[PDB]
Amino acid sequence: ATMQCDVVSVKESIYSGAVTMLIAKGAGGELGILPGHAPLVTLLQPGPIRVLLENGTEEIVYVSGGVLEVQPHVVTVLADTAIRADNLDEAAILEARKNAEQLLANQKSDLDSAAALAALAETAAQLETIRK
Amino acid sequence: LIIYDDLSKQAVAYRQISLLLRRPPGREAYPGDVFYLHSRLLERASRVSAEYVEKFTNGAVTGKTGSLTALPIIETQAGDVSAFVPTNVISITDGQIFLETSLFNAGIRPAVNAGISVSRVGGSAQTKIIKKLSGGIRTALAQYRELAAFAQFASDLDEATRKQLEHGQRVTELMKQKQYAPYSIADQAVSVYASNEGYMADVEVKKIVDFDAALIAYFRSEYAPLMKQIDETGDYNKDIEAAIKAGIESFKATQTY
């Protein structure tokens, strides 16, 4: 019986009820009840982490990237609500350079680097806010 | 049955005659007794008992009653129903049918305002089939009146309320008709049964009138004997319900509007 097992990729979490033995996909040889100390933290394969709950009960364990930190009386897993990627910056720049530029249009053509420009005009927007 | 095309012009003529007699004036120049003028006329539309008929005819007619129906018409200025004569006449009748200028321009041809229109006699003046089938119209229209303002944002509403709104829209469109083309009891019953049972949830809102006209036309050429039984008798029986259902199913199966 494991003390507790939780995964937190979204506003809610998936809890495990008294895991009778701690088996996980990509176990690494330290699978089982608390060893007195965890060996390490590892990037578990996005393959779903097969885990048998109390009395060897299997549950839907589909993972999209699993980081597991077992501990004496503590088992915590960090997982992805979505497919996991390492340095996904290339798609980030792809999205940024295509959506903003299309959205901005003249806003990007202007690209007025000045920030404290026409501060009285921002105060004019403020006075409009003052207007009913 | 008697119909007075306008009682407002009669009131104006009475006012003119009285003012020429210099009788004491009043609100809007009307004389002292304007309520009596229309009350004594509109109280003569009544149903008499068989005993009264027998006494009047000295026995020449037995076991028969009589009935006079009245439909006065009154014109109001700019929508003001609080004027003198309209308020005098509203309190006398047993009901009121309200026609709105905005509804007329909006496309509602018979242009009745169901919200304020009332009938004191109620369901006591209907055939059995009409009285049985009438409730699903009032329920739907009341629900649509309550939920009308939610048209813009409807996805957030649950499915039941959306279905009620769609049914209200379809019913409100079915209520349209054409002048010089009165419907019969059988057509009204068939249309109301098709509406209540939900066979027109499939159809588009815009094409309600065409579907209704085509369905009525098919029945009067295919199920005319059933219609004859409904028209003469008017009684609603399990067999009549089954026949109506089967006919509507056949029309929906094989026809193109």
């Binding site: - | 004491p24 007794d33 004594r40 109280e43 649950d158 039941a160």
Partner: protein, 348 residues
């Protein structure tokens, strides 16, 4: 001549005796049109007054429709209530001089019924129904116009208040007996500022508002439990316990009214225990307000219940406390008193 201390008249109806208690010698305003069983309530009051207080009743119609009068007469004959009531009709097709002086004709009969001494005195308690006093004021206005009196303020007889004091004052609780009165009131143009309703409301002691919504709901009577008021619902005259019981049921109903829009638009799927409990208690109270009458026994086949006030107070206290949080809500429909509810519940 008349000495009175506030003394409630017990009709036997639950909602009225709880939220809008009457008073021997009071005047009551009835609000609502047709389709809500107004005549049924009037018949029930006529029957109950004679059943409990040995009191006869008088009916006076001011400008009544002939068809409605015929229906009322035939239905009262059918319900075996006509033996205890008198009738005076004033029809629309008559000149205004007739529809004006008919309330006095009914009042004379009611006053005579009051002053008939029983053995060991004790007079009698009698009632008086006036079909519509708005038409009484209009009859006065038309008569004044006919005689040529100059118009007052906004198209109303120079002499309007004096006349309504002549009528309404005579309905009082004297030493040897009492006369109450139930009157239906029409508000012209939805204007309480209009002189006629303003002159009317200065004499009323209670207002009963009949709602079409509750009638459509299927609970009869449909008397509104949030818009009806009284001048006897104070901690002094009616007793403290009654006062806070009525106040508690009123704000519970108020909360339910404020919440029913949300409960009807987006359903009950929201998660909040407290308002759900408020909803259930409101529904139980709404059903409990209904009761069967002795006028419909003939057409219904079920007997009536003249529930005493104490049982209503005790049952409402128990319902508010939370003791009857297990009884199904269907066990309160048309169930008379409090205990009956329990058996009805144990029957299920």
């Amino acid at each position: 001549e008349q000495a009175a201390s506030t003394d409630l008249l017990e009709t036997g109806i639950k909602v009225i005796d709880l939220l809008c208690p009457f008073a021997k010698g009071g005047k009551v305003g009835l609000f609502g049109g047709a389709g809500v069983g107004k005549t049924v309530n009037m018949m029930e009051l006529i029957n109950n007054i004679a059943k409990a207080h040995s009191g006869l009743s008088v009916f006076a119609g001011v400008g009544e429709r002939t068809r409605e009068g015929n229906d009322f007469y035939h239905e009262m004959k059918d319900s075996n209530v006509l033996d205890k009531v008198a009738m005076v009709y004033g029809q629309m097709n008559e000149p205004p001089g007739n529809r004006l002086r008919v309330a006095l004709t009914g009042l004379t009969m009611a006053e005579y019924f009051r002053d008939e001494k029983d053995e060991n005195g004790k007079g009698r308690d009698v009632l008086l129904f006036v079909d519509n006093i708005y038409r009484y004021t209009l009859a006065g206005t038309e008569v004044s116009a006919l005689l040529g009196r100059m118009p007052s303020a906004v198209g109303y007889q120079p002499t309007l208040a004096e006349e309504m004091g002549v009528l309404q004052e005579r309905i009082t609780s004297t030493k040897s007996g009492s006369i109450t009165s139930i009157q239906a009131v029409y508000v012209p143009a939805d204007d309480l500022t209009d002189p006629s309703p303003a002159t009317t409301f200065a004499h009323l002691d209670a207002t009963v508002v009949l709602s079409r919504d509750i009638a459509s709901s299927g609970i009869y009577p449909a008397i509104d439990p949030l818009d009806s008021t009284s001048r006897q619902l104070d901690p002094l005259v009616v007793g403290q316990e009654h006062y806070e019981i009525a106040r508690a049921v009123q704000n519970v109903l108020q909360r339910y009214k404020e919440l029913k829009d949300i409960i009807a638009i987006l359903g009950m799927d929201e998660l909040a225990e407290e308002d759900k409990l408020v909803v259930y208690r409101a529904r139980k109270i709404q059903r409990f307000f209904s009761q069967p009458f002795h006028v419909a026994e003939v057409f219904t086949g079920a007997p009536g219940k003249l529930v005493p006030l104490k049982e209503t107070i005790r049952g409402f206290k128990g319902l508010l406390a939370g003791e009857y949080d297990h009884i199904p809500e269907q066990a309160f429909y048309m169930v008379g008193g409090i205990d009956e509810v329990i058996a009805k519940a144990e029957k299920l």
